[PDB]
Design a protein around this ligand. Structure first.
Ligand SMILES: CC(C)(COP(=O)(O)OP(=O)(O)OC[C@H]1O[C@@H](n2cnc3c(N)ncnc32)[C@H](O)[C@@H]1OP(=O)(O)O)[C@@H](O)C(=O)NCCC(=O)NCCS
Ligand SMILES: CC(C)(COP(=O)(O)OP(=O)(O)OC[C@H]1O[C@@H](n2cnc3c(N)ncnc32)[C@H](O)[C@@H]1OP(=O)(O)O)[C@@H](O)C(=O)NCCC(=O)NCCS
Lengths: 402, 402
């Protein structure tokens, strides 16, 4: 398949079957980094992502587009022969959907014993009848893992946004696939990976949930974007706008208390010598600290707080709106936002490849492919004849380039 | 170093230097999956994570604890010899801090030309003077990437929580390190990776930001946990509590419109045949759909909505509180939450290894190590004498087991 040789993953062959974010995000990350990546869409309908006006130009760039019925007759026989040349297969289904349709892990390893198989689902490959085969999206994974209940304001839980759990789940799939890939390169035998979205998100929400599991209470939600436990952390107003700050570290606490008028608190039974952190609930002075911090910050400009906090080594930043990013000097310097050409021949703007590999940078070599774009190319490369692939399209088992 | 042989990453050697979540999360994930992982803390102070009462039992499990001044005299000479046996080194600093302290990539590859180096920072290894050396935490990365501005309610932006950006950044580091690791196993030459937290989070927030970069407007924030654009997606109230649902798909929309009393809308110029999604803003009927959905849902119990939505293949779930997880039958069936023994000999409860590798499951073999726990073991393994490592402790350059 014609493509430039670049990135740490050059010449690795990846195929994924899934829609929206989670599955496709996992597979396309390989493409960002130079792998050969086949996106499989059904033959009758297309990936739901295509309904989004701009995003798919980013999230499906560098891909090859197959369109094949991977479960019906010869359409299946093709998919499985394809699997013989595949290093990694990502699939995102309602539970063990592939297995209950005939394509088990053992059937797959029959065609490629080295194959790394990554199963992405809401609730896992096995469990109970009630949950295992349920459909799932990001919000479902947030709801079921206790992530959603931790987000929002004191009085109003809400999902983390945009579609946060889909990105964590796809990223975990990518990670786990590369880990399994390493094992294949070291023992010569394939692997199957069972990634349940809610288990991913259960992990991502443990910071305070670990307290509940081990004697404690659950923390509340934030109030107005302030950390539920630690004073001086989260969202604050200066005289001229929103900033964030983290009041963490001995030196930071000592010098900041001095600025805001709380010097006399340092060295008390409650704030002894090496205090690195200020717990707002446990501390009688917790609310006083917030009151004085708020008052001191409201006296200063964002720029002045930034200068003083750079002196004290207190992390902070202006809360940037989307219109402010393009022309930020850090963004500009690092080409964090770039441009590329779509397939239709139009100019498209959005994030560059991340992260930056030094010796083998990733690169944007192709825009989002059309539905079925590369089907004929892929089947001829797998060994199907011109007429033989013409029959596949005919019996409805494949969609050719429009 | 004594440890069981398990997981896809058995016999891979990983060292990380960093505190809190991002850096350590990246390194410890290797440990979940069977790698040998050395956590480096400073000799004078310890990782700030240790101030948290329970979480570190999860986030530092399966680790070996070094405590060494990696920048001063012989402390440096040790670190660099250690680097000769290391496959992957994760470091989290204020920008290019290691390089401006003498330990450049070229110095590191001098001691190991194959080494994969992963640099985690707020703002990158290079850029402008204003930003490149700034300290960063999760909230700083959320603020600077336009992630924070997208979270919260219409009237109140807030961070995604808990510390969402630290997990994305550490997960990306893990992923990118394994990708680079693959390249080393295929060309024999090392790699350096520049992971800027804000660039990670810029990527994770593109779903609607891509509209802004390409002609459009930015979406608003959610109202009460409802999707800013798509009707029938996000947080809803039933008669007896919060659920989430995603109204996506032709069949789902058709049958759900029929239930809620909006049948006559199907087939209009605005909702034609294969409509997969309902845009609340663009659609004159968008608000009507919400009103009827809300009213229909408030008539039913969570259990009844679940049953009907399982018939229509509409993804949904009860919003679970933290006290509801342990005894959920899916959690129980998959052992999603487990127990292990700490070093002090106490019983600790929390998430199991995720995800589940089939042939080479990860496993919890050790609790969180104490500050300096394994220093003497590591230095003797690297080739330092008993007296030779006694001198390191003496000149303040290392901390031994308490
Ligand atoms: C997202 C999800 C709900 C969509 O599934 P769905 O609406 O029920 O069904 P699809 O649109 O994928 O297609 C329906 C059927 O066609 C099949 N189909 C999909 N790809 C096919 C292929 N290329 N060839 C033949 N048939 C195919 C599917 O196997 C599915 O089978 P099933 O009815 O036996 O269960 C489901 O894939 C899922 O829960 N995935 C896991 C979590 C996830 O990735 N969520 C979305 C990202 S946020
Ligand atoms: C988190 C962060 C702000 C903390 O840094 P800090 O408070 O300024 O400093 P540290 O507590 O790490 O230590 C201070 C100095 O001691 C050094 N130190 C750290 N580990 C050391 C080691 N084991 N041996 C000798 N010195 C060490 C550091 O290099 C740092 O050097 P510098 O003063 O030249 O810049 C910073 O590491 C950072 O921005 N990291 C990147 C983003 C990140 O990971 N954030 C935290 C997770 S959410």
């Amino acid at each position: 398949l014609p493509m430039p040789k670049f990135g740490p993953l050059a010449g690795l062959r990846v195929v994924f079957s899934g829609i929206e974010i989670a599955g496709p995000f996992a597979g396309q990350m390989f493409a960002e980094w130079g792998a050969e990546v086949i996106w499989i869409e059904n033959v009758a309908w297309a990936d739901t992502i295509r309904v989004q006006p701009n995003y798919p130009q980013l999230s499906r760039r560098n891909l090859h587009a197959l369109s094949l019925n991977i479960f019906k007759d010869e359409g299946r026989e093709a998919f499985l022969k394809l699997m013989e040349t595949t290093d990694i297969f990502i699939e995102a289904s309602k539970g063990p959907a592939f297995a209950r349709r005939g394509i088990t892990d053992e059937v797959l390893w029959q065609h490629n014993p080295k194959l790394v198989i990554a199963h992405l689902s809401g609730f896992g490959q096995y469990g109970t009848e009630e949950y295992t085969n349920l459909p799932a999206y990001n919000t479902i994974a947030q709801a079921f893992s206790g992530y959603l209940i931790q987000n929002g304001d004191v009085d109003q839980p809400m999902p983390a946004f945009p579609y946060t759990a889909a990105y964590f789940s796809g990223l975990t799939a990518t990670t786990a696939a590369l880990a399994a890939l390493h094992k294949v390169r070291e023992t010569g035998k394939g692997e199957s990976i069972d990634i349940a979205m809610y288990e991913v998100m259960l992990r991502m929400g443990q910071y305070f949930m670990m307290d509940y599991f081990n004697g404690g209470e659950m923390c509340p939600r934030m109030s107005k974007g302030k950390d539920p436990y630690y004073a001086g952390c989260g969202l604050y107003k200066c005289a001229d706008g929103y900033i964030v700050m983290e009041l963490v570290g001995i030196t930071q606490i000592e010098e900041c208390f001095k600025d805001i008028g709380l010097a006399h608190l340092l060295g008390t039974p409650e704030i002894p010598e090496g205090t690195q952190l200020i717990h707002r609930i446990e501390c009688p002075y917790g609310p006083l600290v917030e009151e004085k911090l708020d008052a001191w910050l409201a006296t200063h400009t964002i720029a002045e707080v930034k200068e003083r906090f750079a002196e004290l080594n207190i992390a902070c930043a202006k809360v940037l709106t989307v219109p402010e990013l393009e022309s930020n000097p850090q963004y500009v310097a690092r080409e964090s936002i770039t441009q590329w050409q779509t397939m239709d021949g139009r100019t498209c703007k959005g994030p560059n490849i991340m992260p930056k590999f030094k010796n083998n940078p990733g690169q944007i070599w192709r825009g989002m492919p059309s539905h079925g774009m590369d089907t004929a190319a892929i089947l001829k490369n797998i060994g199907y004849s011109e007429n033989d692939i013409q029959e596949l399209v005919s019996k409805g088992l494949a969609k050719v380039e429009d």
